[PDB]
Ligand SMILES: OC[C@H]1O[C@H](O[C@H]2[C@H](O)[C@@H](O)[C@H](O)O[C@@H]2CO)[C@H](O)[C@@H](O)[C@@H]1O
Ligand SMILES: [Au+]
């Protein structure tokens with residue numbers, strides 16, 4: 231549709247609780263008479279710049295914070311200025327994830343970290359270690375099962391392994407990220423992707439498995455483990471798989487370091503409904519009842535709102551999510567992050583498919599990222 235004064239349009243990814251957010255929309259409309267339309271288009275993070283200037287696109291856009299600094303660089307985001315009373319309702323470190331060049335450019339919603347999810351019936355004692363997965367897959371294959379399936383088409387899911395032995399995106403040193411110091415082809419990064427590719431070479435994993443195939447196999451009881459975030463928990467609840475959430479496997483003794491995202495709601499700088507957007511986000515979404523309605527649809531993870539997080543922290547699944555988050559790092563929000571994801575995605579896909587060696591896939595990824603900053 232088209233952006234119009236008097237009504238809100240919200241974009242959020244299809245794997246999130248858009249039906250729950252729509253319930254918050256209905257509450258807002260009952261209170262204010264302002265209809266709220268929640269859409270989940272494909273490739274919404276790539277479309278938002280090409281539509282904000284034309285007058286399409288949303289009033290409010292949800293995504294992990296890593297993309298927002300590139301949006302702010304093009305002026306697509308409105309500066310958010312909550313007063314001290316509202317800022318204190320969210321954890322300080324989540325505000326930092328949406329601060330770009332001194333200005334807050336979004337509202338933090340929830341904190342996302344990948345975890346090892348496993349079938350308690352197929353696997354009462356899951357492995358603590360990547361190195362013991364092949365032997366486990368061999369034993370499960372003889373019973374008609376597999377050990378591990380997760381999305382190999384998005385580098386997000388492979389990055390905890392790559393970073394375990396020392397891979398990193400942009401080196402952070404004393405205040406800022408060094409955009410010319412990229413760490414995707416260093417020794418640790420190469421050792422991580424190499425281990426992944428040898429799982430595939432030895433038929434302990436399939437290069438073509440994406441999100442749906444990984445989810446379906448685990449939720450049907452065909453694979454013993456998957457790697458996913460909290461949004462996936464709802465579909466597992468429905469499947470009636472006795473599942474647990476636990477610490478990611480280690481590699482060469484070191485923990486996997488997932489890239490941590492803060493799901494954030496930015497306001498289109500050209501929105502005719504700036505105030506309504508802040509009103510909706512501050513007074514309806516970022517409340518105990520609002521986050522509850524979204525979380526019941528698809529779990530958010532560690533919510534940024536402290537009052538609601540103190541209740542969710544008692545859940546062992548959330549405790550495991552936080553533990554994996556403490557071992558990883560929070561993503562940078564700098565504009566160079568889109569070049570980083572694009573290039574690492576090619577490296578992972580080429581290496582897994584055999585189109586390239588692990589070494590030259592990561593060396594090519596390194597060259598592309600460094601040259602473009
Ligand atoms: O794989 C590259 C992308 O990784 C993350 O995207 C995550 C996102 O954080 C999460 O909420 C969503 O449900 O899953 C995707 C992975 O497909 C970064 O946030 C993106 O910017 C990257 O492009
Ligand atoms: Au957490």
Ligand SMILES: [Cl-]
Pocket residue numbers: none
């Ligand atoms: Cl639906």
Ligand SMILES: [Cl-]
Pocket residue numbers: 307308309499
């Ligand atoms: Cl502005």
Ligand SMILES: [Cl-]
Pocket residue numbers: 321322323324
């Ligand atoms: Cl903090």
Ligand SMILES: [Cl-]
Pocket residue numbers: 329330331332333
């Ligand atoms: Cl800053």
Ligand SMILES: [Cl-]
Pocket residue numbers: 405406407564
């Ligand atoms: Cl910086």
Ligand SMILES: [Cl-]
Pocket residue numbers: 416417418
């Ligand atoms: Cl090195």
Ligand SMILES: [Cl-]
Pocket residue numbers: 381383384440441442
């Ligand atoms: Cl996919």
Ligand SMILES: [Cl-]
Pocket residue numbers: 558559560
């Ligand atoms: Cl961190």
